[PDB]
Amino acid sequence: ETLNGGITDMLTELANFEKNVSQAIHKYNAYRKAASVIAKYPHKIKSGAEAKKLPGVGTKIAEKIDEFLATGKLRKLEKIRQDDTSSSINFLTRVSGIGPSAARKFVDEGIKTLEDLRKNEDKLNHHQRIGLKYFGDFEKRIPREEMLQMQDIVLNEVKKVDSEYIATVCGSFRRGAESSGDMDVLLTHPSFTSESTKQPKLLHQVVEQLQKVHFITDTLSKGETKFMGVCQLPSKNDEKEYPHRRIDIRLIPKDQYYCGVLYFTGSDIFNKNMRAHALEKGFTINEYTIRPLGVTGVAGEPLPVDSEKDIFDYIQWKYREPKDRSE
DNA sequence: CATTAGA
DNA sequence: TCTAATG
Ligand SMILES: [K+]
Ligand SMILES: [K+]
Numbered sequence: 607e608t609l610n611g612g613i614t615d616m617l618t619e620l621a622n623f624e625k626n627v628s629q630a631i632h633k634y635n636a637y638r639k640a641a642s643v644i645a646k647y648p649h650k651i652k653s654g655a656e657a658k659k660l661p662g663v664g665t666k667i668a669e670k671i672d673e674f675l676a677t678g679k680l681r682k683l684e685k686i687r688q689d690d691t692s693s694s695i696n697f698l699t700r701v702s703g704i705g706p707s708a709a710r711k712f713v714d715e716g717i718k719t720l721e722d723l724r725k726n727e728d729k730l731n732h733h734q735r736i737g738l739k740y741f742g743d744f745e746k747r748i749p750r751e752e753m754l755q756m757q758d759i760v761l762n763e764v765k766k767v768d769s770e771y772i773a774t775v776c777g778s779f780r781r782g783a784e785s786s787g788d789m790d791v792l793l794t795h796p797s798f799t800s801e802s803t804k805q806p807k808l809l810h811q812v813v814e815q816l817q818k819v820h821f822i823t824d825t826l827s828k829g830e831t832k833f834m835g836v837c838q839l840p841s842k843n844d845e846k847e848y849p850h851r852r853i854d855i856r857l858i859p860k861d862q863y864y865c866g867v868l869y870f871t872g873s874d875i876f877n878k879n880m881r882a883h884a885l886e887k888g889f890t891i892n893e894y895t896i897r898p899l900g901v902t903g904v905a906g907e908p909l910p911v912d913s914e915k916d917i918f919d920y921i922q923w924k925y926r927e928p929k930d931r932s933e
Numbered sequence: 934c935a936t937t938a939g940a
Numbered sequence: 941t942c943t944a945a946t947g
Contacts, residue, residue, distance in 0.1 A: 705945050731939075733945080790947090827937050827946085834937080834946070854947075856936095893934095 610644050613651055616674055617641035617667070619683055626699070626706045627692040640667050651675070694718040702737025702744055702852075703730075703826075733826050736836060743850035747785040755839055756789055756821075756851070763815040764793075771795055771812070772863065776870040780928045788852035789837070792867050799861035806830035809857045823850070832856045862894040864911045869893045876931040880923065887921040896920060 621637030624630035639662040644651060651657045653675065654668030674680050686692055691713060698709040701723065717723055723730065723738055730738065737744065748756075757775045764771045776790045777783070793812070798805050813833050816822040824836040833855045841847035858866050869877060870893075881891050890897045895908040896917055911917055918925045 703945070707944060733938075788947095829937055832936055832947095 609650050610647060612674060613657075613671060614641045614645050616670070616680060616683060617644070619686075620670070623686050623692065626709070627686070627689075627695050629710075636662070636664075637667070690718075698723075700745070701734060701741060703733035704737065708734075736824055736826060740836065740850040744852060746849050747787065748789070748851060749785045750779070750783065752839060752848070753779050753786055753789065756837065756853075759819075759821055759839075760789075760791060760816070763819060763821070764812060767811050767815045768795070770797070772860070774863075774867050776867060778872065780871045781873060781931055782929050788854065790870065791853065791855045792858060792863065792870060793855055794858045794860045794863045796860050798857065799859035802859070804830065809833060809855070813855065822853070830857070861911075864914050864917060865891065865894050865896060868914055868917060871928050871931060873932055875933040876926070879933065880921070880926075883923065884921045887923075889921055891917070891921075 617637050618641050621634050621641065623634075624632075624637065625634035628634075640660075643660050643662050644657060647660065651671060654670075654672040657663050657671045658665070658668040670680060670682075694713050695706065695709040697719070698704050698712055698717070699706060704712075712718075712723075712729070715729070717726055717729070720738075720741065727735060727738070753775075757779070760775070761773055764773045772794050774780070774792050776792050777786055777788075779786050779789070793809070795805070795808050798808055809828075809830055809832075813822060813825075813828065813835070816837070820840065821837050822835050823838055826834040826836065828834070835853050835855075837851050837853045839848040868891075884891045884896065885899070888899045890899060890904075896911065897905065897907050898909065899905050909916075909920060915925060
């Protein structure tokens with residue numbers, strides 16, 4: 607957590623690089639298990655050699671550990687950090703809709719900057735255009751105070767359209783968080799669950815609503831179960847318009863809401879942890895259900911859930927307000 | 934780890 | 941169809 611710190615950081619620096627700038631999925635995957643394993647290790651690595659005894663720790667990496675231990679740096683890292691191409695790649699990547707694969711390509715064509723991409727809007731797809739369009743706004747955090755204004759609007763139309771809907775804004779928003787990165791609305795309806803052959807409209811009606819009143823302003827991608835957009839709070843009585851915000855709405859079979867909600871509410875740890883416990887408690891939990899364990903090794907058979915409680919009850923735990931689902 | 938775009 | 945990009 608801090609004793610193996612630099613080593614793990616150096617290493618991830620390294621991994622991240624192969625994966626992006628290079629297409630070394632392997633080396634990339636290499637640096638990762640290593641950083642992983644050096645990370646668990648309970649002692650101060652004092653040398654490659656010592657490290658080296660670890661699993662995943664080969665000669666390539668150990669060598670790296672010595673240099674880093676030896677001097678407070680590493681050339682390779684110094685070199686990559688300098689590297690205009692790689693730099694270029696790292697940056698393009700901040701554009702929404704630009705993964706590495708596109709970053710490389712663009713670079714190749716020589717589009718290394720924001721300005722570049724503008725001049726070349728034509729080489730970009732809708733998602734990418736939008737992302738470009740909102741590069742600043744997308745990068746900016748969402749203050750809760752705003753999160754409260756968006757949530758408010760959202761539940762309102764949802765309800766106007768059909769009173770049968772159930773919506774929930776998940777994420778750190780749900781867990782307290784002073785600000786968030788984007789809004790995640792989990793949607794469902796009684797008339798749609800596991801079997802009941804869809805109702806693509808169910809997603810549609812809603813988006814259409816939000817659009818109709820100018821809450822939604824663009825669509826990144828819209829499918830029958832997952833819509834991915836951009837929204838904006840009504841710019842007041844002037845002098846202050848709101849930043850463009852990413853939103854995602856997703857339909858869910860009512861018979862799997864709460865686990866979904868559960869899950870998506872996080873946190874990553876509270877989850878893993880509550881999850882590990884259902885194992886003892888004789889269960890299995892995942893983004894959609896909760897099944898009882900069967901001695902033979904594994905088992906099936908989804909228990910029925912009507913609320914975040916049911917899941918709790920089942921693993922015979924203390925109901926945890928989202929607020930403190932921190933871990 | 935599953936859903937969407939796009940070519 | 942595959943492959944990229946999100947989350
Ligand atoms: K080893
Ligand atoms: K990106």
